[PDB]
Amino acid sequence: LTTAEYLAYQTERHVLTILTDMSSYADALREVSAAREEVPGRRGYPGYMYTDLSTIYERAGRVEGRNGSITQIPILTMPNDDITHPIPDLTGYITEGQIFVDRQLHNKGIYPPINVLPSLSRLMKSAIGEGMTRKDHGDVSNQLYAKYAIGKDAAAMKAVVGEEALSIEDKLSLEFLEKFEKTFITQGAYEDRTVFESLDQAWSLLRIYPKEMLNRISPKILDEFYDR
Amino acid sequence: FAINKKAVEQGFNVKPRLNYNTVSGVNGPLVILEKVKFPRYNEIVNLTLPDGTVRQGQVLEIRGDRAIVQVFEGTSGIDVKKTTVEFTGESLRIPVSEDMLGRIFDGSGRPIDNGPKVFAEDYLDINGSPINPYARIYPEEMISTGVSAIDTMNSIARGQKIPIFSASGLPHNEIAAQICRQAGLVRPEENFSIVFAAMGVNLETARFFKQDFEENGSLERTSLFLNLANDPTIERIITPRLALTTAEYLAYQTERHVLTILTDMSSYADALREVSAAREEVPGRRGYPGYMYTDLSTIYERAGRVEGRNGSITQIPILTMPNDDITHPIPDLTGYITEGQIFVDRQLHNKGIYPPINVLPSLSRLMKSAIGEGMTRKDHGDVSNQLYAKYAIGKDAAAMKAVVGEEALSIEDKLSLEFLEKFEKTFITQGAYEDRTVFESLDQAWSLLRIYPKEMLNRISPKILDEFYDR
Amino acid sequence: EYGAIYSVSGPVVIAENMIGCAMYELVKVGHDNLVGEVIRIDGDKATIQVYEETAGLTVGDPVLRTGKPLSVELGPGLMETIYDGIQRPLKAIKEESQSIYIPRGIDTPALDRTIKWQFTPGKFQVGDHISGGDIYGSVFENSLISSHKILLPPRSRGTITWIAPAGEYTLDEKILEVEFDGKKSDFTLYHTWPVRVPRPVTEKLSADYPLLTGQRVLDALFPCVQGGTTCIPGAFGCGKTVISQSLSKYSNSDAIIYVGCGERGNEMAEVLMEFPELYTEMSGTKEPIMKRTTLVANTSNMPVAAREASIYTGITLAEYFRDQGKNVSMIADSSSRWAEALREISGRLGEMPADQGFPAYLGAKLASFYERAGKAVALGSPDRTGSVSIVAAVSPAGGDFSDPVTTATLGITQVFWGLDKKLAQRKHFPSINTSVSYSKYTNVLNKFYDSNYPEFPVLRDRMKEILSNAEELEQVVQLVGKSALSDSDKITLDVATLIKEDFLQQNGYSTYDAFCPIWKTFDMMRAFISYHDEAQKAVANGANWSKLADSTGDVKHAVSSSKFFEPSRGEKEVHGEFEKLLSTMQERFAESTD
Amino acid sequence: AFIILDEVIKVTNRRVNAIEHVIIPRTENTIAYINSELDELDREEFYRLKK
């Protein structure tokens, strides 16, 4: 991070930083803190691990005078695939959103096995928008998220109550989910997509529903684009 | 008499107090003295800050010539070369008298009604002396709360311990005020008094209590012990002691039937947990100290009904289950000590029912001792069963009606569906200032049981059914 | 006198040869004069807590003690400023050092000593007796706050001897001499006050006036009062950062502060750069909104000892403003981020945790902070009245009911707006759970309601019971399927959905619905209740609702579009529309039964 | 009506049997396991504080 700071703020160039195993960093912290006896924190991690990590994650962003920036993408490995573990839990309160990688999608041969439901990007709503992307970028994502959740709930319901108990919304949502996970997320390891191509490919799916069932989407947007 | 002899040998002699200036450490809420002459465990001291202000304290431990004091109002500002500590001489005592009814005291017994000092009749230790379990006698007769849901489906025999379980947002602090304002003896005032203790309450709630009791006449009997949230968190374990000492003075030395209400025992438990960690004790289950059962018992079991006296003491704590967890340590430990409980339901609260009592899980373990001929009407013990059965039948019918429709319901379920909502909207629903006697609530209960034909009510005795049914 | 350093471990320093130090008292550590506060005393040692970062402290470095606890400076110039945790000006530091970093051990007066202020003496003349809290002057600061009223600091009194005339002044020119036992007192345009001792007040009162947040659901079901507490579990779906602009730009607050205690760092940069461009139009045109604001920023990497000392600074400033008969409203950012730092300090000192590691006095520490709120009648010769209405915010660390912070807060707060994951997952904004939430102020508000809108309470009760019945039937209708439901029940289902979709749903990123007034909400609420009652009546008189819905038709759409009558149209030009809508609905239901 | 009623009763009884036999016990076992794990963690925290 010191090298990145020097390059970005005293040489005026755009840097991108990657940190592989913050878990293997917290582990060393725990070991050294256990060497010298101390009042342990949760699961034996030191109490000040939050303020230790904050000093790492909090070097980023632009500054008024310079024309450089630093972007951080620290990889991280949850021990038992739970966000409740102290490391990911604390890192959730310092960074701005996550990019979850899920085991179940991976088992089904889906790449990248990203799970969008628990992911987040707290700066999306300012980086997207009219004059900087397509005007509909702020509603397609919301609609897709809502329908993904509804279809997931329907699929959960099918187990103990049977398909016949499903309703028209649930009849459509399973199809939407099964085509979504297999078409929109699935992507080669070298395939490159621009934002516009992805937006069109997403509009393709939403045509499955009739206009009246899309309610998280603006009336004006639904008219200029749904007809194509 | 003998009073003239004991008073003189107690008073009319003065004892000077040592004044130390040898503070040798401050570690959080504790102040450590160094060279004390014959310290005494559980004493009261008076720190004098270098600014001339005064505080209180209590010795927690003693070593060879060393005392560990804990300050009530906080430890900020005390240095090590100018503060001075003075030892009063003995433990905390409450000046008690028979004419303090109608007064309002704060956590540590200091009146806050802009009146004078209590002008004691005696000083009493604020704890100890368990009741000999050979002078105890079993409860009898009724204490009329004045609430239909509590004086018909359940009951409070004078000499009982009935906790009221509530939740975070429920209006238990209004039901408590209503009970205090309306409670009394079943008639067919005049040796009846109330003692009220509020622990860890909002200031607005303190104002509400004060004004409500002032303006409704309940203060001619009661005696309040307030303890706000900013008050020292150690006074919160003194308040119930003071309240119960006052109660068992009045009841067992002036022959009064007393009613005691304690609010937010959960706040008391929190205070206990905080105080325990000050002495570096390893916490027990869920963080609460392992010996909390002993304290809860020593507080609850100061009530009863004894042989050689006409007085009595009835208890009514009020809990607050943290997350509606009946398995939480506080209610679980309360279960093994007290008999019965009154449950307050959230679901009824959203529907607008007041008081939002639910009767399916509620229970009074001594009801049969406070009903029947002599202390109430002779139909009490069977209406309170018929109503309980038909309420459950109505809940079952309402829950199943939406599955098989309503045409697939027998006649009994059809009738019960219309009995249930009337029961929940005319019987349980009671206004804040609407007072009902135990009789005009039994009559209302009859007005609901006449919906069914005389044949269906198969739990009421035929003798009872013959007389009361037709009116 | 000077001590010396004897040990160093992280942010905890153990000086020695220190006798006479108070239990809390600012000191100066090292050659950089780092600021610290004594925490523990034993003999002559004195465990110090350093608010800077300790690196390079050599044993033997001198330690100096000042002789008074952490104090904040109060007076003119508090508005439009940005402060760190312990009230050091930020932009002044930046344009003084010319850098972008914070030079360690830097002292700058919290209030500019170089700006001239206009003074106007009050109504006191020599020979009078003056007590702590009296007003004896008035300074003109902005156009939005035309009279900053000077106060004699509490704990000070006497008979005055010389009062300066009107003119121009700065913050270092004495303008009052008070004699009590000798003229040993001169008073400038400011003073100081310890941050842990609540400011004295003549007498507390009861809050009987609502806070108009603008969200229909809050203003309707769970109202808040001017001078009360609150707790707002939020995740940016609940709208923590959308309500923040409303509470200032629309609510009637004479002032407002803001305490970011543990902010991300980029969102703080957003706040700092987007408040200065917000504009209001109350009282004609007073365009800028920073003339009425003060902000206490604190990034997540600042010294942990300085995160605890933030909310005390904020609440002290709010109380000072209340002492002039204003209506402040704190907005705390994160209570959880504060308790975490508090636990870290406790563990560092060496303590025995209770519960999930917390120091076991968290409840008694939170209560003291919360119960500084509330209306009050100020202290001083001219009668006044002000209020401070804190609005906290907790972050649900997984279980939104099991974390000790929420448990502690739920015992002392008067309002609660719980967060539900489902309404967020469906992207239903604002996402607040009506099944688990409450507002104890719903009783004391009827005195205002009846004099203003005497029908509002019963309508609220009816709406709540309809909603509750909806979820009550939800389990059975999902486990079996809607095939045996009666005709009066499907009405409840399709009215509960209508309400959940067109009343409790709101988006502040528009113009028609960004701040719904109270009359508009009352009208919408009455219309919905009337529609439900009419449908129930239609089925009662006998008609299959499956076809009655088709027959009625557009009257179902009109209410769903009722949320588009822009308040800009006025107040009567919406009332007329609602009247005609209700009349048309009644006529349509009357004529459709044949 | 006979045929339709036979079908409906068959399906409902089958579903009830399935729920009774291979749903409730699974969830009960899961609850017991989680309950044991919580105490397992509590013991370790207690031991650390004791040390």
PDB file of N, CA and C in Angstrom, chain C residues 241-242 244-246 248-249 258 266-279 289-290 295:
ATOM      1  N   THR C 241     -30.006   7.617   4.538  1.00  0.00           N
ATOM      2  CA  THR C 241     -29.433   8.781   3.880  1.00  0.00           C
ATOM      3  C   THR C 241     -30.433   9.544   3.024  1.00  0.00           C
ATOM      4  N   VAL C 242     -31.683   9.092   2.948  1.00  0.00           N
ATOM      5  CA  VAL C 242     -32.716   9.825   2.225  1.00  0.00           C
ATOM      6  C   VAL C 242     -33.476  10.681   3.228  1.00  0.00           C
ATOM      7  N   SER C 244     -32.227  11.846   5.884  1.00  0.00           N
ATOM      8  CA  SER C 244     -31.340  12.848   6.462  1.00  0.00           C
ATOM      9  C   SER C 244     -31.584  14.218   5.845  1.00  0.00           C
ATOM     10  N   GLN C 245     -31.754  14.275   4.523  1.00  0.00           N
ATOM     11  CA  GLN C 245     -32.036  15.551   3.879  1.00  0.00           C
ATOM     12  C   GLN C 245     -33.424  16.061   4.234  1.00  0.00           C
ATOM     13  N   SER C 246     -34.400  15.163   4.374  1.00  0.00           N
ATOM     14  CA  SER C 246     -35.753  15.595   4.707  1.00  0.00           C
ATOM     15  C   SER C 246     -35.811  16.207   6.100  1.00  0.00           C
ATOM     16  N   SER C 248     -33.861  17.913   7.668  1.00  0.00           N
ATOM     17  CA  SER C 248     -33.313  19.261   7.696  1.00  0.00           C
ATOM     18  C   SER C 248     -34.047  20.211   6.766  1.00  0.00           C
ATOM     19  N   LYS C 249     -34.316  19.782   5.536  1.00  0.00           N
ATOM     20  CA  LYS C 249     -34.873  20.659   4.519  1.00  0.00           C
ATOM     21  C   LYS C 249     -36.364  20.909   4.698  1.00  0.00           C
ATOM     22  N   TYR C 258     -24.961  16.727  13.177  1.00  0.00           N
ATOM     23  CA  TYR C 258     -24.811  15.437  12.513  1.00  0.00           C
ATOM     24  C   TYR C 258     -23.506  14.837  12.992  1.00  0.00           C
ATOM     25  N   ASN C 266     -15.702   7.202   2.011  1.00  0.00           N
ATOM     26  CA  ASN C 266     -16.186   7.764   0.757  1.00  0.00           C
ATOM     27  C   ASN C 266     -17.574   8.362   0.901  1.00  0.00           C
ATOM     28  N   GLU C 267     -18.435   7.733   1.701  1.00  0.00           N
ATOM     29  CA  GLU C 267     -19.758   8.293   1.941  1.00  0.00           C
ATOM     30  C   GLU C 267     -19.664   9.579   2.750  1.00  0.00           C
ATOM     31  N   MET C 268     -18.681   9.671   3.644  1.00  0.00           N
ATOM     32  CA  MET C 268     -18.409  10.944   4.301  1.00  0.00           C
ATOM     33  C   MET C 268     -18.007  12.002   3.282  1.00  0.00           C
ATOM     34  N   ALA C 269     -17.163  11.629   2.318  1.00  0.00           N
ATOM     35  CA  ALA C 269     -16.803  12.564   1.261  1.00  0.00           C
ATOM     36  C   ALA C 269     -18.024  12.980   0.459  1.00  0.00           C
ATOM     37  N   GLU C 270     -18.993  12.078   0.301  1.00  0.00           N
ATOM     38  CA  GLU C 270     -20.230  12.434  -0.383  1.00  0.00           C
ATOM     39  C   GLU C 270     -21.027  13.443   0.429  1.00  0.00           C
ATOM     40  N   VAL C 271     -21.169  13.193   1.728  1.00  0.00           N
ATOM     41  CA  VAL C 271     -21.955  14.087   2.574  1.00  0.00           C
ATOM     42  C   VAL C 271     -21.350  15.484   2.563  1.00  0.00           C
ATOM     43  N   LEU C 272     -20.038  15.563   2.795  1.00  0.00           N
ATOM     44  CA  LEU C 272     -19.367  16.853   2.868  1.00  0.00           C
ATOM     45  C   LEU C 272     -19.509  17.647   1.582  1.00  0.00           C
ATOM     46  N   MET C 273     -19.598  16.977   0.436  1.00  0.00           N
ATOM     47  CA  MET C 273     -19.669  17.660  -0.845  1.00  0.00           C
ATOM     48  C   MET C 273     -21.088  17.854  -1.349  1.00  0.00           C
ATOM     49  N   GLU C 274     -22.086  17.201  -0.747  1.00  0.00           N
ATOM     50  CA  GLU C 274     -23.448  17.338  -1.241  1.00  0.00           C
ATOM     51  C   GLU C 274     -24.373  18.111  -0.307  1.00  0.00           C
ATOM     52  N   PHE C 275     -24.055  18.250   0.984  1.00  0.00           N
ATOM     53  CA  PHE C 275     -24.780  19.255   1.762  1.00  0.00           C
ATOM     54  C   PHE C 275     -24.557  20.666   1.245  1.00  0.00           C
ATOM     55  N   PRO C 276     -23.339  21.103   0.950  1.00  0.00           N
ATOM     56  CA  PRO C 276     -23.141  22.513   0.587  1.00  0.00           C
ATOM     57  C   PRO C 276     -23.926  22.947  -0.640  1.00  0.00           C
ATOM     58  N   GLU C 277     -24.546  22.002  -1.348  1.00  0.00           N
ATOM     59  CA  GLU C 277     -25.331  22.321  -2.532  1.00  0.00           C
ATOM     60  C   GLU C 277     -26.827  22.102  -2.347  1.00  0.00           C
ATOM     61  N   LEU C 278     -27.271  21.628  -1.186  1.00  0.00           N
ATOM     62  CA  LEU C 278     -28.699  21.539  -0.909  1.00  0.00           C
ATOM     63  C   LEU C 278     -29.243  22.918  -0.570  1.00  0.00           C
ATOM     64  N   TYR C 279     -30.513  23.145  -0.897  1.00  0.00           N
ATOM     65  CA  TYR C 279     -31.133  24.450  -0.716  1.00  0.00           C
ATOM     66  C   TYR C 279     -32.523  24.282  -0.128  1.00  0.00           C
ATOM     67  N   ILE C 289     -28.358  25.662   3.082  1.00  0.00           N
ATOM     68  CA  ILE C 289     -28.802  24.928   4.261  1.00  0.00           C
ATOM     69  C   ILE C 289     -27.681  24.699   5.263  1.00  0.00           C
ATOM     70  N   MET C 290     -26.433  24.999   4.902  1.00  0.00           N
ATOM     71  CA  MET C 290     -25.332  24.862   5.847  1.00  0.00           C
ATOM     72  C   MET C 290     -25.275  26.015   6.835  1.00  0.00           C
ATOM     73  N   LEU C 295     -21.423  19.759  11.478  1.00  0.00           N
ATOM     74  CA  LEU C 295     -21.143  18.375  11.139  1.00  0.00           C
ATOM     75  C   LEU C 295     -19.883  17.921  11.854  1.00  0.00           C
TER      76      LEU C 295
END
